[model samples]
Target: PKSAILLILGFASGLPLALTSGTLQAWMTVENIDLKTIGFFSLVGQAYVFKFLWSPVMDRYTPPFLGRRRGWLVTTQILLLIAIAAMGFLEPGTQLRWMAALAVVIAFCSASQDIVFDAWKTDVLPAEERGTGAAISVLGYRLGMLVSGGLALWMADKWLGWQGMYWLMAALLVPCIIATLLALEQAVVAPLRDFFGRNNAWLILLLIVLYKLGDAFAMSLTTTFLIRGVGFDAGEVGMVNKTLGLIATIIGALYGGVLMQRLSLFRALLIFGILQGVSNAGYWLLSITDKHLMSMAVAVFFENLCGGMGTAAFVALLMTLCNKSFSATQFALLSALSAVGRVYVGPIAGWFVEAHGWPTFYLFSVFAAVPGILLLLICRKTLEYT
Candidate 1:
């Protein structure tokens, strides 16, 4: 039953992500918004990177209802449902600021929900079940992304239009609310002081920031790239890029979980990180070649597969580093630092793609991955625990 609830929570956690980022990019692209503005919109996700700033308050206080975790979960879900549905009425082309402001609200609620959910998972899951729980969470999360990212695009193109599609997407959060209501809350402190006191603490922090930098950079403009750079229509991208990519991500994450049992954390991070960097070549290839569906499908699949594997390993590393007593704040802080790359890479990616073009930009992403892997090599002793 806990597994089931975790899956639902994970799904809810993922649903808002693309609605604010990738899918939103697609919407802006369709409205003929320029690349620079679309890229700047990614900064709206800064709420996620800075979520730790308010996480201590969440940890220190619990709502009057539904216990601690569920209270925050339900609150955030309600807010997200309203904010997301409201977005349906705003015209991204005409009322761009309003659209962005609403997006920021949804992102705040979404990030808050994530902090509570992560804390809940840590408190609830037993040590033995953590691995399976993590995998299940990723599965559901990716599934949610698939629905919001892929299915939403298809619906928008096929019948519903963006407004109707967003309304329906907002409605999907009903299940999450139900799940939160039905679920139990599980029960966090010197998070920063403790984490910073560890050996190689600063180095670990740097590694977190850089580990996924290349992958995030490569994917920063993917939805935009597909529609504008590759000329795939919304429906085609929904069907091919998102659908196939979700499947690949799930498979890679599961496979990475299995591999973690056999490999040291350092080995898993190094190996998967390398695959992630190499996978960007797929986008580079597509950029250099003419638009071809087969090539696009292949590239998207491989890139997402490697990305999923890298994410699985990366998430595990974050979990391993958390001090259970302060898991809530510690994990939030660590995860927020990890997201620095994903959030800040947006403007740089936009500027780089404009100046250097897609092919060269992708090549740079490959190199961006190197620093993290090298850091892993240097810090091998710290992370190589049995």
Candidate 2:
């Protein structure tokens, strides 16, 4: 039951992302918004990438009454519900500025909620259950994204209008609030800063930022790539890429976790990183082929499958790096660093696509993986702690 609560909360945590990003992008497309504008909008997600800057505040301060974790969790959830529903009420055609503003607010609340949930999970789960607990929570997160991305789009087009559907999505948070209210606070773990202090910490964070760089760059541009570059409709992209591709992603993550049992963390990073690079080549192929659904499927499958494997390994590596005392802070910082390339490099990707054609752009993305892997080879000795 406890794990179930964690899973649902994770689901709640993921719901706002699609509403703010992909689903919003689709709405923009519906209003005939151009590609470059949608590209700059990616900056809204930078809130997530910079959340670590304020994570220390979350760590140091507890809201009165509900305790540190739960207080923040509930507060963020309430703010999310308000912000998200408010976004739905705005007309994106004329009120795009309002839409953008609310999306930023949603991102802020959602990122805060994530910090609390991650810290709470680290605090409560015993060492033995950490792997399984984290995995389940991620699964729930994906499901929530699925609902917001694919299911919400389908519902909006078929029955409810956009405003009505978003209200429904906001209401989905109720169960998560109940779960948060029921959750028990765990005793704070003491911080551990032994041999792996400041120096080793920055080195690991450097690798973390570099490791996911290529994957992030590729994905940040994908929905726009499909809708504008590939000549597919927004609905088709949502149903195919967001819905079916995510199932492949979930399967790949499970297999990656199993593979981690056999391989060292460094070895997993090397192998999975190679797979991630290869998957980017699939997109290049799609660029040449042009508008074939089968080709898009193949590209999406390889990208997310390899991506899921890479994420599982990386997430586990993060767990190995942090001691309990600083788990929340360290993990937040690391995760934020990991997001740095994705969020900041995104608008640059739009400019790149404008300058270079699709084929050249995708190949560039593929080659971007090389430096990260080379860095891994140099740091392998340092990374073998797990």
TM-score of each: 0.91, 0.88
Each model's lDDT comes to 0.76, 0.72
Where model 2 places Cα greater than 4 Å from the true spot, the runs are 59-71, 125-128, 182-202, 233-237, 264-266
Q: For residue 120, what is the lDDT in candidate 2?
A: 55
Per-residue alpha-carbon lDDT of candidate 1 for residues 1-386, written as tens digits (9 for 90 to 100): 65777777777898998888888787787767777888887678889887876776665456556455446677778878888888767765876766566878988888988887777554656465576766787788888888778656876777746788887887788887887788602322334568778778888878887777777886788878887746564444566876788878888888878888877553667777676777878877777676655778888789889888877778877787774766556778887887788888888888888887777777865577777777778788777653
lDDT of 2 at 210: 79
Question: lDDT score of model 2?
Answer: 0.72
* Per-residue lDDT over 149-223 for candidate 2, one digit per residue giving the tens place of the 0 to 100 score: 765677787664679888788778887788778760222322324325555666776787777778876776676
Clashing pairs in 1: none
Query: What ranges in model 1 sit over 4 Å off?
Result: 63-70, 120-129, 184-189, 229-237, 264-266
Scored by lDDT, the top model is 1
